[PDB]
């Protein structure tokens, strides 16, 4: 069931902003490891004495990497005469963020029709304001409320090139890499208590629980057309294996986002390209499933994927789940940085054509039991 | 003239340690951009709850990348029961360093016969102690004194695998990249006043001024066999163009190291490999000289390099200087990180065979006037 209770008009995921201490080095690692292009910058070259910001794009996916300069560069400035292109930025908050959390996402941004309305309605509905609505160059409105931990939900709205004050990267500095990734599918937070976190963010968005049929307990909030998908996990204590959610909270110094799931139009090409670059600057992937997993996949998705295709999934380590309505292909990278905190999921969904409806196939929770049982079988 | 006034027995450059906020991402960018191998680690996987440290190697060159974890991970520890593998490390100093300076080198390490002697003699001769001598696993001794800014000179000495507590990276995680780079040639500091900085570090090392035949004023300190080369610059104010030294001090928040010069056994192969990767995660190079430069190189090094070779230098943008005793091939990357601070120089030296004697060819100071005049000619 979908009550379509969105309290304001939301469109799509717009961009993800990482806060780091050196934007250049994270951005170039990410661009090579993921096949994202260098498309827009805001930094000293563009008259910004406050922060360094570099945008990577693959299809509709927008990764923003931001780090502070020395405050001495902008010490004469005040907020009305700032040279920062993102007005919510703050040296102290950014430096506090990176040194408390290590590398991670500071903002999950969604495009809305009216970011000032979206902010007002949100705050009026219990959201903790983080940055008030600012109109950039009479063209773009930007507002931030608190989401969880030190992560903020960022509303952007356009009257009619990323943001005012970003210049387009000169073609000789922009190499057209592409491994297949096309858009952000979902962004997942880890919190210590799911209940209050659910009722807080559902309370100011009007997002509804998405029907989702060892480790955690979770639930997924979804906008009206279920294209903005915001899962949230909490740990399940007292087990035998320590919950990854609890390890996350311990190493992250509290609540934050666990993973970004990126949609590829061809998860097979994507993972071939990403695996080729794993050990030369790219990303590592979590260990593969035991062949007992793939020896049981023919019994479950043999109607969706052929024998050659299922064997292909065995090569790249791709996991496969399926809904009552769709099939899901997924795989998890190792953590993106020093700490065992944030990671990336590559996915592709099969089915639910009307366009594809959001969340087709679910989120892979079955692959936990498919993995445990598959481990037992291989042990033999 | 070489008085050989070293006050203790120094061997070679041993390693360079970068302090950052995320070691993983800087290390992987550096390894791809420079062709260095992932050879040793100390981190959570190795029982180190204090800091994450990853060593990259190309020939004899050792780049160490270190970042702090959350202090909460090691809050029960005291200095005698620490799990840090580098005992001089300090969460507060590291976080203060990265947030004051951005990405940069924290330590220039040199191997000595006796690091405890080297420390004692040094401090007794005016060096400001930074970390006292610690004997690691009855095998390695490590000591630090202050060099300039927040950069420390690091003495290491071996009785007879990098340091105790680093494990060797498993071969499947270690891809044998190599673009030709073989050793560190020199490490250069920018300070606000050369005089006091020279007399301070020459005072506790006994290093002598190396005979070196617009922008800065510099001088080079050298050990007995002139293989540990420590140039130092200060700005030349009141000019027309703002000194790069002064820009460095402004954006770095004070004194620090300006550049690392890495020796390649084949600067032509190195720069082809590095340029191939510039726009896909590697390093950019400073803009090339006007062809008027290369149209005048035949008049100067036509005895050392052939017509095909000089044209090759024109392709990769390599500059060429020469001593009274040797020839120098060199080129400068763009800054390694967000700030216009530290950068890397690739070099190869021709001549002075006895082995090659250190510093053969000088350091390229002529290429300033060769560049200005070459610009004037091309302007025409
Ligand atoms: C992250 C994730 C998801 C899913 O994406 C997420 C929630 O599960 C549910 C709510 C939102 C939804 O998006 C699904 C399956 C997963 C993983 C995952 O990280 N791993 C790695 C791992 C295995 C053992 C120990 C530690 C880690 C898996 O094996 N499976 C099977
Ligand atoms: C760094 C360096 C060196 C040399 O290595 C260093 C000192 O000069 C002297 C002491 C130690 C010695 O190692 C030599 C030549 C250089 C550069 C250099 O960075 N550039 C870039 C640039 C050009 C215009 C404006 C800003 C930067 C050059 O053009 N030339 C020619
Ligand atoms: Co997911
Ligand atoms: Co140099």
UniProtKB/Swiss-Prot annotation, chains A, B:
Its EC number is 1.13.11.27. It catalyses: 3-(4-hydroxyphenyl)pyruvate + O2 = homogentisate + CO2. GO terms for molecular function: 4-hydroxyphenylpyruvate dioxygenase activity; identical protein binding; iron ion binding. It is found in: Cytoplasm. One of its GO terms (biological process) is L-phenylalanine catabolic process. InterPro entries: 4OHPhenylPyrv_dOase, 4OHPhenylPyrv_dOase_C, 4OHPhenylPyrv_dOase_N, Glyas_Bleomycin-R_OHBP_Dase, Glyas_Fos-R_dOase_dom, VOC. Pathway: Amino-acid degradation; L-phenylalanine degradation; acetoacetate and fumarate from L-phenylalanine: step 3/6; Cofactor biosynthesis; prenylquinone biosynthesis. It is an enzyme of class 1 (oxidoreductase). It comes from the Eukaryota. Pfam families: Glyoxalase. Fe cation binds at residues 186, 259, 345. GO terms for cellular component: cytoplasm. Residues 12-158, 183-334 form the VOC domain. CDD domains: HPPD_C_like, HPPD_N_like. Its main location: cytoplasm. The keyword Cytoplasm applies. Its cofactor is Fe cation. Keywords: Cytoplasm, Dioxygenase, Iron, Metal-binding, Oxidoreductase, Phenylalanine catabolism, Repeat, Tyrosine catabolism. Binds 1 Fe cation per subunit. Catalyzes the conversion of 4-hydroxyphenylpyruvic acid to homogentisic acid, one of the steps in tyrosine catabolism. Homodimer. Belongs to the 4HPPD family. This is 4-hydroxyphenylpyruvate dioxygenase. The lineage of its organism: Eukaryota, Viridiplantae, Streptophyta, Embryophyta, Tracheophyta.
